[PDB]
Design a protein around this ligand. Sequence first.
Ligand SMILES: C[C@H](NC(=O)c1ccccc1C(F)(F)F)c1nnc(SCc2ccc(F)cc2)n1C
Ligand SMILES: C[C@H](NC(=O)c1ccccc1C(F)(F)F)c1nnc(SCc2ccc(F)cc2)n1C
Lengths: 306, 306
Amino acid sequence: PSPYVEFDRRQWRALRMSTPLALTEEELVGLRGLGEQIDLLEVEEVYLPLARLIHLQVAARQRLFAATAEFLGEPQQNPDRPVPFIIGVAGSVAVGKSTTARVLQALLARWDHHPRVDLVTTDGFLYPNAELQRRNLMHRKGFPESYNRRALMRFVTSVKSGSDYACAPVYSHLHYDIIPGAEQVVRHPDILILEGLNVLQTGPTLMVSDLFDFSLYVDARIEDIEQWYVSRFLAMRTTAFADPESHFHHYAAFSDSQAVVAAREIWRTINRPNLVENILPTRPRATLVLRKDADHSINRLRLRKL
Amino acid sequence: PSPYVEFDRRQWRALRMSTPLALTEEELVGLRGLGEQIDLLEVEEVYLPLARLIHLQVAARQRLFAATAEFLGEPQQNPDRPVPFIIGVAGSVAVGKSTTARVLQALLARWDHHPRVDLVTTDGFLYPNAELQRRNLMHRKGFPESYNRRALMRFVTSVKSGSDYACAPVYSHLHYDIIPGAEQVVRHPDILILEGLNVLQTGPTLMVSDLFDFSLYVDARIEDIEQWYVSRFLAMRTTAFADPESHFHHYAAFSDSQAVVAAREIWRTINRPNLVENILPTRPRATLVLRKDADHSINRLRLRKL
Ligand SMILES: C[C@H](NC(=O)c1ccccc1C(F)(F)F)c1nnc(SCc2ccc(F)cc2)n1C
Ligand SMILES: C[C@H](NC(=O)c1ccccc1C(F)(F)F)c1nnc(SCc2ccc(F)cc2)n1C
């Protein structure tokens, strides 16, 4: 007896899921439009129903806003609109958060109830590298204290307050640092998806997850994430590591054997301990847990019972 | 710009609230049965409308359950019924949590959508005095670690899972200890109200508030709670202190002037510090913050924006 409705992938496919409603030409185009070999049979068979489920929560919240506003006789201090519905997305580095978040963004946007869907990563709230050196935290990049938690919280509070303007900084996955002066502006979207390692973490007072209406945790076996983490590092030889500007340049040259060793070391010393200590404990706090197989595909969904 | 809608009592009074909700007399008689010398003005102008706000949220959550169930084609994995809607109620010792909760319980029960409204206090989750001594924690009774947190979490998790049978222990307010072998049985109510000092307290991992659907914080100036505390202390001389085997009997025979001094001192060393350190910081985590005047009447309501 547990707080989850659990489905494996078979069962979830085996449906009897009221109206189907398919993806268009068109919508499938735009979804490879970000398609790092993004599996479209997975988008259609897992992510789309999952997006409908969430849509039911967004729609219910919009109708609550209205039943509540009507009851109070719409006073001058109640907002005219629902404030943004915020969805958190948590999980290890290299688990596919970003893809999950990007797919959901694209799918949720197709409803008339909420076509304006934003996506912000908390990576942009990490302290800049120089700032991090100054605090003796470089070896702790991506641990909770590596983020400007106060700015992170002010941002989400601003969005949840029905502000019309809220700005976050930006983090380069090329330079592995904050890009000075770059900014992402959010403008009272109907939905904000907030993606990051730390979004479901707790603190002593009001924490950002207090401002979430729904959250996901992307899960997998820790040996599988290590493998995806390694592959991603290797593939970086061709891309980000290829620039001589990079602090990781000397890595371009490494053979598959030596790049592995260098990767398995950052995993072991930084990302794995971060996962075990700080990220995985936040997993039972999510509304929905998606567990991925070694081959990247979803094999299990746990949804909090309603 | 802030995450809640604010009404002072004058603004709450300019109150074009849609439904003239029908209060019998009858029900008002029951309502006197919990005399914190309860003001029936208060019930009529404040608690009733609030209970309607809360009702909206239970109703929305109930219908969301059904739309979601129908969307999944009501599979075997899904429960047949919504799980209990859980309301947390926080605030200092002596602030009026218990009364507030007893009143919402009576008001909420009168909708047919949700007639079975349970009330549990987390006081039953304090370690028995015996255990507290064994831990060197007696002078910390009411502080976070004085509770069996694990057991509390297991209790709320069981209720949120849709268990038929969940049990809390009971804490005597006459013997100021856990009552051995005594248990309160909760049987899948439509609404559980969970009341206590620590309900909106934060933990490293899954906290009880993660399982709340709504939460209330009863607030007042720190001086005003002292006064209520002292009076409640004076009033126990005849009742709970009359007990000869009570570890407080030696207070029964205290004159007024002398009992004020003992009370103001115990306030200063256990309950006031607990409020500052552990209870007051949890305040902005509540969905609703009610602030009471010295007269026990609401002068400020703060509701999370929807
Ligand atoms: C400590 C550092 N972490 C980050 O930059 C970071 C911090 C917070 C959130 C996300 C990230 C990361 F950019 F994906 F790595 C890091 N961890 N591994 C690396 S090597 C490049 C790399 C990044 C991500 C990955 F999945 C594989 C390799 N780096 C530079
Ligand atoms: C440390 C002790 N606290 C409790 O028993 C307690 C612990 C957790 C939750 C609630 C309570 C209390 F029973 F309400 F005090 C306490 N603090 N003041 C007292 S004196 C009795 C008393 C209780 C409450 C009150 F408002 C006035 C007097 N006592 C026995």
